[PDB]
Structures are given as structure tokens and as C-alpha cells.
Design a binder for this molecule. Sequence first.
Ligand SMILES: [Mn+2]
Ligand SMILES: [Mn+2]
Lengths: 339, 343
Amino acid sequence: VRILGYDPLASPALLQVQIPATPTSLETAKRGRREAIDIITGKDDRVLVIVGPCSIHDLEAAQEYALRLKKLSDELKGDLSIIMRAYLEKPRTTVGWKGLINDPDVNNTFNINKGLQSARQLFVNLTNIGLPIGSEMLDTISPQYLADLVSFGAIGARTTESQLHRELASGLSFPVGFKNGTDGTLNVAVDACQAAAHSHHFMGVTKHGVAAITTTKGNEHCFVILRGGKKGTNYDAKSVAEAKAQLPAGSNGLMIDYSHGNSNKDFRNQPKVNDVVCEQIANGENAITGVMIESNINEGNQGIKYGVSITDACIGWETTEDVLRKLAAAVRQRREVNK
Amino acid sequence: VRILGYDPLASPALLQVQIPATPTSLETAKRGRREAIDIITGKDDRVLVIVGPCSIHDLEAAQEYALRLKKLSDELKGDLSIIMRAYLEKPRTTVGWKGLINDPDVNNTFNINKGLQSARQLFVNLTNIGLPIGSEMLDTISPQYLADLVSFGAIGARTTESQLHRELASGLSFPVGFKNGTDGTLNVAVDACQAAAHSHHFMGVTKHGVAAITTTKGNEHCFVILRGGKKGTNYDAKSVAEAKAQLPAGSNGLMIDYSHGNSNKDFRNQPKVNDVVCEQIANGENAITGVMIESNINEGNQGIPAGLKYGVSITDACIGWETTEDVLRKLAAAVRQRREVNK
Ligand SMILES: [Mn+2]
Ligand SMILES: [Mn+2]
């Protein structure tokens, strides 16, 4: 009585042959994973940076942004391992545009087959220039269409507590960051990393698009992302110290999101959070292994203009350069301290 | 790479043929929905009570429990609309038994096909005696196996914020209670009821076991459940008032969970919460339209070693049957007194 209908869906396998990854795409995705792993598990002293638009609504703008970020990445690679945020799925407070896959025309017509085709072509396009990508894993079915291209998955603050998402993460072939809860505390993200590291059994959709029972092996590459929230921002030294105190043995390093709760509703704060995070890193803080930044070609946001976000406000490209070059410098200073 | 393997799964349609609902089961599920709707939307001045075990691990003990509840329910039906908690799916803090579907043998063998058979067979058994059931809709796939039998769904505190669960609720053909967040605040449940009231378009599994694009119509029968949390319990008149102040026009009545965060680590607190909720109801509080209670044959809980003690929860601690009966009779008395105030 509350289903209007069901519309046919191309299977993940079909979409994969219709939009094949190139050899460069596959290699890039594998490289982003290895580099991300090496950083969060403490094998490498660089910082893992997940940086880019809040959401992707426009493939051509995403490509321009990617080409700039790939160049800067090549400049800063001795110090930062940079993965582009190419987020396809957006969790809403109540209702609103859910992203590229859900409604690619952004006009409430919801052509999910086209959204999947655009998302995959986008992920091929970005990785084919040698730039790794990451996305929030909101839908538990869409990763079958796209995982082969993905180097990093986030679980958003609103789903970190969800058993289905901990299950999903336990089977993903790449590192997964759990955002702290929207109340600003970390316990649910700590719990989520514990849960995701275990093997799970649950019903899931396969590559031929039918439901089956999946057994996962557990994902040892999950980590907490500090993203602020109602109790306050948590990118400062006390917050980091409190976080480190709640991490179990075996934990991976922490990532700090400069945006969302940590920006206090003003995207212009991201470079201020950077300064505070840089000061900790530069002076010897080794538990901070990652950062996340909402960045776009042009700054701010707009309601539903080229290179301007239609979801959260982002810093613009030039501020992005200055932020990442500062962070790289802090990484070099931490290396000095650690000698 | 982190996928150990895939095992075949019977489709919802196949299981439904294999384990058909009886005409009594079906009418029972429909009646439970009607009564719950009429209560949360203010048509009926009885209270909707979702009561029963934290989880079901034993079909035969659930059946004995269901028979006692159906008896008491027939006695108290002028005042209380009763739906049994028959919870199949358990969200864990980190890890632990996820319930009857996931591991019906409770021994880490995860025979999910047998779990879905046991669950469906259980749902037909309980509803076939005229007692409506409710469950937490934790899995977004399993409701295709079972929804024909279900009169109430809960979205748990840990999934009330999840867009997937709000999408799920928007296409369910029964009322859905969204618990407040584990931090004890209710904005996320209020936001959830708004989200689930809209049509959504998302990928989901159909009765033939294949993925397709689902379009839902939106669910106007969603309501907030107050279940306490970090900030403190929230069953008292001030919390209730604060809850009513956040509800938008068009909102349904509130439900109060006597257990979980509202019982402060102690199942013995459930009757204390009952007393405070009853005082509010008996004195004219009309926005409280529902309550939820973790109740079993016997009180308390036990660890999982089969060597299990009969009629005792293997998840959260419950009040035993005898306490349950006292609580429910007192709640019916408050409903009666509320009717006097309203005249
Ligand atoms: Mn954002
Ligand atoms: Mn419980």
C-alpha cells in the first residue's frame, strides 16, 4: 500500500561492462588504498587528505577540480597522500537532494539508472587521470556498482551507529572512516570500528543484482573521523587527547574533518581549524594521520553557477592550495621532531 | 577481497508460498494496524502498548507468552490496544547475537535461510491466535519476507538518523515508531518522522529477490518514541512537554518506552516509569498515546553458553509476566481515569 512501484535496475555486473574501468583507473584505486592503509596504520608519516566538494553534481566541473588536485597532489606527494572527495550520496537532516546517483538531473525525477551510469563514468573519469577518490558509503547496494574504483569510504555521522553500515564496512575492500556522532562524541565511532573489524553475515545484493547471504571477513582499516557536533568542535589538542584516550589497542590513527561540525557553520573556518591541526602535527602529534576538507573550484555554496557546491559551502581552489601547502609543511616539521 | 562468500537465499515470494499466512493471521495483522493508527492519530482514546520480550529466541516460549498476553489483552481491550514485541533483529553496541533471523541456532552458525523460516513461522503462529505483532525494522531486506504479518515497526535509537531507514519506513504499510537518539534527544526522531512522511526513490530488493528501483508513497503513521539516553530519562511531564513543543502540526501521538534508556540500567525501573506515565495519563495528558515495555515470562536476562533457562531474555533484562500484568492493569486504570478527565 505504500509502494508506488518498482522500476528495473541494471545489475552492477552489467554496468561494469557497459562502463569499464581503464587499467589506469584500476591501478589508481589500488594505489590510493595502499597509501591510505600505510598512513592510518602508522607505516608512513605522511597525512592522508580526503579533500574536495561536499557533493558532485557536475562531471565536467569535477574533472576540472580533479586535474588541479592531481597537479597539487604531485607537488605535495612527499608529504600528503591526497584522495578526492567524489561524494555521490548525501544524507539529509530531513529531505533534500540526495546526490548524483539518486537524482542526477537534480530536478526530482530520480533516474537512478542514469545516476548510476553517471556516477560510474565520473569515477572512471577521475581515477583515469591517476587521482584516487572516496565517497560516503550511504547506500548499501550502490557500492557493488562502484567499489572497484574507490580507495576510501566514509560512514557519515548519521549512520556510524547503524548496524547495517558497520556490516557494510566489514566487507569493503578499502579503508573506512566512521564519523563521530552528530552529538559530537566519539564513542559510537569507536564502537563502529570495533564492530566493522569483525566478520558479519547479512543479506546483501550481489553483482548480478539478486539478494544473497554475504559473509564478510572484517575490515581492520577502519578509523575515527573527528567532525564536531552538538557538544562542540573537536579538532583541538584536548579533543585529540581525549580521543586518543578512548582508542583501543590496535586502533588506527585519527582523521580530523575541518568542515561540518568543526567549522561551526562557516566554511571560512576550515583554514582556522587547519592552523590548529597543523600546530599539533608540527609539534609532534603522530595520532593525527588524516584530514578531510570540503573544497571546490569556487568558494561558498548556492541554492538549487559553475564550480560552486549545491550542498555544504566549501573553500575555493586557491584557499585549498594554501591550506594543503601549510599542512604539508607541518608534516615535514613533524618528521624533524620525530628524528 | 573482504567478502568470504555468498550463499543462496530463498526469495520473499518463495518463503511466503512455503509458509502461507492463515486468514486469521492476515486479519489480525490488518486489525492491529487499524487500531494503532486510530490511537496515534487521536481517533481512539485507548493507549497503544507494544509489550513483550526484548528479543525472540525460542518459538515455543514466545507462543506461551503470546497466549498469556492475548488473554490479558482480551480482558483489557476497552482501554489498551496491545501488540506483542516479536523482535527478530537486534542492533548491537559493537558485536553480539543479532537475533532469530541472523542466527536462529544462537551458536554462531548464521543459518539465515532457517532464520527467515523460523521468523516467518513465528509471525504466523503469534498472529494466528489473534495477537498483533511488532518488530524493529533493522534489516532493510527482511521486511519483504514478513511485512504481511506485521502491525507495528520500530526504528531503533541507533538507526533513527539513518536515511536508509527513513526511506524504508516511508514504504512500510504499518505505523512506525522512531526512537529518540542514544544521546537522549528527540530532534532526530522528529526529523525522521518528517523524512519518512515523504515519497522516496531508492534501490531495494523485491519479492522475487532481485534489486530494483522502489518508489514509496510516504508514511503518515510515524511517531516518536521516548526512550531516554545520555542526557537522562525522558518519560516525565517536563520532557513530555518539551517533546510536544517540538512536534510539527500534523504530528502523531508520542510513545513512551519504559525500558532501555528510560529504566536507567535496571528492568525493575519499568513499573516506576509506569507510575509516572500513568499519573500523567490519569490527569489528562492526551499526547501520550503509546507505551512500550520489555516483558518476558520470567524476569531478568541471562548469558548465552540449549543450556538456556526457559522464558528468560538472552538480550536486555525484562520484567517478568506477573509484574507485566500489574503494570498493564494499572495503565488501563489510568486510561479509564483519563476518559473521566476528558468529559
Ligand atoms: Mn558536507
Ligand atoms: Mn531491548
